[PDB]
């Protein structure tokens, strides 16, 4: 006769991940590589969003 013993599942061998990246990144260069920095009496807060 013929019998159902087990079922094979062909498990995956690797992981693929693909995501979107915006061309503009951030003005950290305008902050860390800035030519001039503010006095400790008038601190420079720049908003990043």
């Amino acid at each position, epitope marked *: 006769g013929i019998y159902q013993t087990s079922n094979f599942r062909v498990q995956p061998t690797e992981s693929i991940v693909r995501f979107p990246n915006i061309t503009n990144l951030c003005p950290f260069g305008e902050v860390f590589n800035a030519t001039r920095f*503010a*006095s400790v009496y*008038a601190w*420079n807060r720049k908003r990043i969003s």
Partner: nanobody
Framework: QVQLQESGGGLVQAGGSLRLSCAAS????????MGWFRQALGKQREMVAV???????QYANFVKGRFTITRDNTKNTVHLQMNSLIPEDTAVYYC?????????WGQGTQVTVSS
């Protein structure tokens, strides 16, 4: 890039008169406050005078009744009529834009008075 143009100093005999000028460029948002400061070689920044957008003028006791600040609203510039000169006024002066964000300084104007 906020820039302050300072001009009008030099060598003047005792009793003469000069007219310094700072023009402000860049952002310089409307509620601004600008002063002039003094520094002689070996001393600190001495607050000479200050003017705000309110048109009020504040002067120190060092130069009582001698130096004046004049405002130009059209170009938003300032001129300091510096008269009745005395050797104790021998110091390089600098510009101070309070504004609302960081305060930008000038490059300097040499003022010498001696005989």
């Amino acid at each position: 890039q906020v820039q302050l143009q300072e001009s009008g100093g030099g060598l003047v005999q005792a009793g003469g008169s000069l007219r310094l000028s700072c023009a402000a460029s860049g952002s310089i948002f409307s509620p601004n406050t600008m002063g002039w400061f003094r520094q002689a070689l070996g001393k600190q920044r001495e607050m000479v005078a200050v003017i705000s957008s309110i048109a009020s003028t504040q002067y120190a006791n060092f130069v009582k009744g001698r130096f004046t600040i004049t405002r130009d609203n059209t170009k938003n510039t300032v001129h300091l009529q510096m008269n009745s000169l005395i050797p104790e006024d021998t110091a390089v002066y600098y510009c101070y834009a309070v504004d609302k964000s960081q305060d930008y300084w000038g490059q300097g104007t040499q003022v010498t008075v001696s005989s």
